[PDB]
Symmetry: C3
Subunit: 489 residues, 3 copies
């Protein structure tokens, strides 16, 4: 007649980390970090992205002749753009407030091209101008969405054009101004000097003056074109007026759908998937609450931590018995619960595992795991932004902010996991010791402690007796006289 | 003749949170979060705020005809401004560097209007101009702080004006430039084309040419007015020169008091109170160190946490015999020494561990409060339509710091609660173990958390047993004889 | 024949902090914070810094006559600029994108001055103009690196100049425009009204018209000069064209070395040192992982925390059996195993738990130093008068991150110390429990922390118990014999 106290063990091999010990082998572990991706760019919830290819955003919106497959684009989930696109402004120039326009586009889904100023309304000027920088099949051409107004004969009459926005949504309009490289070019193209371009809306007032300068040749020309933009409100009017150097719009872009999107800098192409979220290096298909692939993601998928390992120990330490109690190790034969309650009566033995402590431990560990997951859902999420050449201070500020927040949250996650692992292992050891202490307490003094975490009963009992002791109903006054009689021997 | 060991219980109904357990009832608890406000917008240490009503800052500084109650304003503590004010720039136009001026005003109290260029000094131009955009009683009018200079007869001579800042402090000066909607209006108003407006200080140099375009009608007019500003230093002069299109100032604004203030975006009005801090939703009157009402506060009052519950467990687990529960009759302390002599009984606690635990828990509470008084404070700012990246950066920074500090506070509270509960349980267990050890073998452990004396003693002997002065070689012989029976 | 358990005590006076307790005396302590400096500005890795003295960066680049000691400058480690330099723009004016240029300079080591437009090529103008706002020995003078172009006789022909960047690296070029204070001065300098200044490169296009206005006399003159800059790429070209009001450059600044550097705001001078980290107050010479002198540092050196005390308790609580306190006689280890046989006595410690405790504590100390290596580093920046919101954003970001990391470090140290002390107490108690259990019932626990053997042992039994080889069946019958 003998019972003992122990704990479950098995043959697993996962390793966990703790604030004191390094690489401790445990029984069960839960993984929280995803470190794999399929390395493909592909669809988001069924809507394919917008593949610019070798074109830039400016070349798309202006109608570069090489970007002729984007003249009508369906709805998109995100925009794919290269780091150094080859096809942008075919005719050299600038694009004022380019990055603000990109920030606006980062949350704009489907466009809709509306002809606001048809090319045939300019009956007092010339509209067939073109440059060899934007050339198709050897002949000169121009942007497909803009009109280059030149003189007709020897006159450049005052050009006027107005549009009232009755489309039903906000409209994006882009105009431009030409800067020649001498006075002869100006007189050859517009037959006027001291010309101007004036644009006016309810919140816009501009009067540009051409700036003639001598410059090197970019794409073969010494002239430059400056492009500006505005967002026209519903039922608002826009007016154009110029005595020269006007690159007038023909189309206007109507914001149609709106939503959450972004601009991804990648060098890959489009394949066939259906993913939930996408990173510049690939697509993620996981249920784990963390990943470490790339800080910038689009869609619905987990948080980013700059760590190589995050494992939560949800079990016991793996120390077996080399070659019968908790002071040596765990038993392989326990396949019922965690905390061992090995018993051995006269007729036989058994390996019944306690349930009152097992369920309490399970509830505790599940609450701990859920809490660890839940306190980290208010993380910092990075949002992409573009900056110009004369905005290095602001770009450094943004980079430092994002990096600092990522570092803080990585530190938080790692430390929380380490401390929770320590507390879990200590808690399990304490639970084994507490069950042993409860057994010894209810036993009183009617058993000789063998020193291996259990005691041979000084009261000779039966299956009912040991079962009741397991239930916690060992009545000392019922079995004190006979036990004392045996102890007197 | 026996004694027992336990702890204290009562009938409180406070619930605290823990890492492994949630909603645990405790004896005593201390709240740290304030969640109530009076819903009123009212005074700050006896100084009323500046109520702009339906007016904007530009309307107040330029003297809109509808903001005529703010011509002379007393000292304030903060400013109330609506989200989309109605009476701003009556004549359509723009205000350059508006957000920078508002940032400057955010830390400026009382002004002092100084008449720097009197209207009568322009004896070569007409100063009676005005528009029906800013109309009072139907007739045209103009801004009350600015002068519209137009032609007199058929000339617009070169207009000059200088001021030397001998007022005694920095002064804010505002001027403007007019943009007509065609050339005919320009000749009808100024007689000249290709005009300019030039302003000169010791650090400002500007030459503005009017821009003529065709524009829709806003407030009935197709023209626009562009306004600019500068801060004049002491003993520094400002020069004005123009051949046309000049809207000259008549008043400068002297900075007089300075201090800590702000601009609060609210749509309410001013009531009668006297509070110590103000939020855009109402005042706060509390001595607790945290609040969760609004991130932007003006005054001296607690830190903001984006949570819903912050309760610190300062007592013991509330379960109604240290291996069986607690006692409802003990009112002395936390750690009990239930004592029962032959002729009497008692319920005295232990008065040495109680003060140690009180000191430890008080130090812990003060340390929790102390570690969190270096938090991050949000500061209001304004951004324009073409500054969306900067606005996004500011909002993300403020939100990130708020989330970080909320996480820190919640983790601290949970870990401290876990430690406190285990600390009290371990203290009770350690006291019982000390009693069992010092009693040696002269006791029969009943098992219910206390033993039965194997030596027969009295009230003084039992007091010595509890007092750490258990003299073993005193009464061990009769105890041995008794256990031998 | 008694054996007792205790922990070693000594005569140290280092105090540490904890969540529950304050000012607790410990045996051994590790300090992590460095709080002193030599208060000297001096060399970093053998390369001296660049000392502008009373000159600003603009004054250094433009060639202020007072900054004639900086005409040629060797390689440098950092730049020393006063908060309010006195010798900057001798002729009043402004510098466009000054802070961007300073940010660019912050990561730029040695410059190399290249003569890109000699002064004698302007054979149709006068190149000897100057002002009394930049005067040397009473006579008028001008910036050394710039040329002021004026009338030659009574004509001002169109000025043209070009440069093709064949130097080998990127180049910085600075030009200017002059704004007179009346029409008469413009005519007496240029014979042209409505002039322009045109600059064009492959990525830069500009045309500036002079602005004339009446202004207060700063430094004696009512005119102003506006200066602009650009970075010219390899094998690129810059063209200058102007009908008047042109301040042409004579030199360009080739970027020669590059590296990690910074601009430092101090009022001191250079002394004869050698250091590896430099803060604006002085140098740092340490092997510790933290410091609290100044947030902005140049070189390699520890992290900045805004605390005055970071001490880690690596030992046991210092109070003079474990149920009474420590032992001053023990010098063996940390956990004691006092034995005393009939023939003699002893003070031997335990060789098993001591190594485990040392390994764990060292692992934890190294971990604490490891988790703070991803800290936040401040980088200096400059902002203009119309950029107060950006300045406030930068200040708040830096201060918030510093506060967050300071909080992290202090909390980690406090929890570490509590865990260390509790761990030592638990280890002592568990060794005592192991001895008590393996001894079984063949002794009477004295009470102070040890037992009195019920059967007389010898030295062999003593070190057998110490080695965990006490055998109950080998000795129980005679033990029960002395039981009576
Ligand atoms: C209306 C128009 O596009 N006209 C020209 C165009 C412009 O005159 C301007 O130069 C824009 O670049 O220029 C194009 O042609 C030219 C060459 O054929 C000529 O040898 O050199 C010119 C410069 O001196 C100019 O480059 C051009 O885009 O190359 C074409 C078009 O006829
Ligand atoms: C010196 C002056 O204030 N002159 C006009 C003024 C300007 O002509 C300009 O329109 C600035 O508002 O405008 C006022 O006059 C006019 C109207 O009464 C009329 O119906 O429409 C005019 C424009 O076509 C002009 O606006 C005005 O704003 O009411 C007043 C004053 O006569
Ligand atoms: C742009 O179009 C809108 C609608 O087509 C015009 O708004 C109308 O203005 C007239 C004024 O004669 C009113 O009678 C209508 O009731 C308005 N319609 C709506 C829907 O508001 C607007 O005036 C046009 N813009 C301009 C500058 O004429
Ligand atoms: C503006 O007024 C101040 C004070 O009246 C002038 O400062 C004085 O300048 C004279 C030079 O003629 C000195 O002798 C005085 O000592 C100055 N006064 C003080 C208090 O310093 C200043 O010159 C005036 N500004 C202009 C442009 O004339
Ligand atoms: C600036 O100089 C470079 C070389 O020093 C010029 O590039 C050369 O251009 C000629 C054209 O006649 C080519 O034959 C050479 O092969 C080019 N050299 C190299 C290294 O590419 C460049 O053209 C010059 N800039 C200008 C505006 O002429
Ligand atoms: C070409 C030139 O530098 N000319 C003269 C300038 C200008 O006329 C303006 O004053 C600009 O300062 O001014 C001085 O008279 C002067 O005392 O500063 C010096 C010089 O004779
Ligand atoms: C561990 O035991 C499991 C029993 O489910 C078995 O499938 C697995 O192969 C074992 N692994 C090793 C390494 O013995
Ligand atoms: C486990 O961690 C220990 C650190 O004590 C390290 O020495 C060992 O290499 C690690 N194991 C593996 C497989 O990396
Ligand atoms: C994601 O992975 C699961 C495996 O858990 C798989 O069943 C599912 O098909 C995957 N989704 C896609 C879109 O491939
Ligand atoms: C207390 O919290 C628990 C969460 O474990 C929740 O189930 C229970 O409803 C809560 N009770 C009250 C009264 O809020
Ligand atoms: C704030 O509340 C306290 C209650 O403790 C009250 O005595 C005090 O009058 C209140 N303050 C005001 C301004 O009403
Ligand atoms: C140590 O800290 C305690 C705070 O508990 C303080 O009372 C005591 O004065 C301090 N001692 C010294 C020497 O600073
Ligand atoms: C730094 O301190 C050490 C002392 O550990 C000393 O040997 C060394 O010379 C010091 N460095 C300098 C540059 O003085």
């Amino acid at each position: 007649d003998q019972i003992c106290i122990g704990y479950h063990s098995n043959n697993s091999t996962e390793k966990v980390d703790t604030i004191l010990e390094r690489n401790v082998t445990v029984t069960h572990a839960q993984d929280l970090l995803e470190k794999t991706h399929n390395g493909k760019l592909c669809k988001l919830n069924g809507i394919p992205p917008l593949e610019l290819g070798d074109c830039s955003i400016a070349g798309w919106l202006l109608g570069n002749p090489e970007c002729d497959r984007l003249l009508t684009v369906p709805e998109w989930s995100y925009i794919m753009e290269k780091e150094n696109p080859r096809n942008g402004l075919c005719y050299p120039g600038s694009f004022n407030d380019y990055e603000e326009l990109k920030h606006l586009l980062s949350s704009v889904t489907h466009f809709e091209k509306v002809k606001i100023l048809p090319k045939d309304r300019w009956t007092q000027h010339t509209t067939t101008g073109g440059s060899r920088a934007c050339a198709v099949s050897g002949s000169p051409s121009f942007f497909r969405n803009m009109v280059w107004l030149t003189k007709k004969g020897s006159n450049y009459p005052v050009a006027k054009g107005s549009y009232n926005n009755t489309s039903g949504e906000q409209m994006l309009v882009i105009w431009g101004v030409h800067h020649p490289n001498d006075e002869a070019e100006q007189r050859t193209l517009y037959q006027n000097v001291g010309t101007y371009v004036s644009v006016g809306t309810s919140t816009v007032n501009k009067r540009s003056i051409p700036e003639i300068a001598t410059r090197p040749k970019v794409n073969g020309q010494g002239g430059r074109m400056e492009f500006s933009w505005t967002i026209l409100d519903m039922l608002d009017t826009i007016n154009f007026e110029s005595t020269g150097n006007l690159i007038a719009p023909e189309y206007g872009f109507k914001i149609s759908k709106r939503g959450s999107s972004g601009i991804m800098k990648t060098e890959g192409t489009l394949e066939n998937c259906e993913t939930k979220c996408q990173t510049p290096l690939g697509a993620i298909n996981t249920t784990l609450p963390f990943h470490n692939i790339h800080p910038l993601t689009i869609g619905e998928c987990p948080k980013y931590v700059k760590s190589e390992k995050l494992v939560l120990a949800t079990g016991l330490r793996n120390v077996p018995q080399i070659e019968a109690g908790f002071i040596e190790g765990g038993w392989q034969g326990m396949v019922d619960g965690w905390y061992g309650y090995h018993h051995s009566n006269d007729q036989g033995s058994g390996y019944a595992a306690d349930k009152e402590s097992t369920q309490k431990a399970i509830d505790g560990i599940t609450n701990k795991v859920n809490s660890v997951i839940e306190k980290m859902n208010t993380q910092f999420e990075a949002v992409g932004k573009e900056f110009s050449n004369l905005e290095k201070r602001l770009e450094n500020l943004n980079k430092k902010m994002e990096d600092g927040f990522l570092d803080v949250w990585t530190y938080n996650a790692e430390l929380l996991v380490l401390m929770e692992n320590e507390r879990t292992l200590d808690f399990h050891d304490s639970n084994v010791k507490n069950l042993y202490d409860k057994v010894r307490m209810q036993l009183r003094d009617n058993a000789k402690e063998l020193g291996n975490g259990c005691f041979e009963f000084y009261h000779k009992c039966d299956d009912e007796c040991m079962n009741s002791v397991k239930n916690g109903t060992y009545d000392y006054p019922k079995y004190e006289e006979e036990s004392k009689l045996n102890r007197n021997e």
